[PDB]
């Protein structure tokens, strides 16, 4: 059936507790299996990362996850790489907002 997976920034977390979301960030710090992300929202999100994750040595990232019951933390389902070792985060913020404005194209 595949539920649409919303593309979100840091402040949409609340609306999707328990759900699978999709989220794009600049990676800040990697403490063991925890990742610190910069949102397009300019807010920050905490992501509980899969054992097999070499995310550290990468810049922008796209996490498909589960919002967890707290308000702002995250189980990683899958993770996509971007940058280099120049994603436009302002564009992303806008794609987030416009996708939110058009459920008929981006959802049920």
């Amino acid at each position: 059936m595949e539920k649409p997976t919303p593309l979100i920034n840091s402040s949409m977390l609340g609306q999707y507790v328990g759900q699978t979301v999709r989220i794009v960030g600049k990676v800040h710090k990697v403490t063991g299996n925890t990742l610190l992300m910069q949102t397009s929202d300019l807010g920050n999100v905490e992501i509980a990362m899969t054992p097999d994750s070499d995310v550290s040595s990468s810049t922008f990232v796209e996490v498909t996850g589960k919002v967890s019951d707290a308000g702002s933390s995250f189980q990683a389902n899958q993770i996509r790489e971007f940058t280099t070792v120049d994603v436009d985060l302002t564009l992303v913020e806008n794609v987030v907002q416009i996708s939110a404005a058009f459920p008929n194209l981006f959802s049920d």
């Binding site: 649409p4 794009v24 971007f82 120049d86 994603v87 794609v95 996708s99 058009f102 981006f106 959802s107």
Partner: protein, 122 residues
Amino acid sequence: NTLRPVTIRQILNAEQPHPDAEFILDGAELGQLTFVAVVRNISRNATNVAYSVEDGTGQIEVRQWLDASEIRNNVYVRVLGTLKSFQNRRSISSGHMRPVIDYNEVMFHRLEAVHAHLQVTR
């Protein structure tokens, strides 16, 4: 005779006014179409290659025809195809499939999708 940026959720919502006729999306013929999604499953057959494909809006099958090992599970892909429904099942026939340039294109595409839709609609 057009090439419409679409989301997968658009694809599934498109109408086929019964018989076996051409699908419509927004009161407009839906011929050749394009989109960006991630590769989730890959099955290979002697004839074709069917990829299981999702863009956050839904998932669809796309099979291309043998007569591209670069592409891999969990990698973004540009798709250029045509909507076929065999026996209620909906799928895209891709002559063209490519790994996405930079992530920014993923973004770009969603917008190209909204904008095209807006212009057929108003």
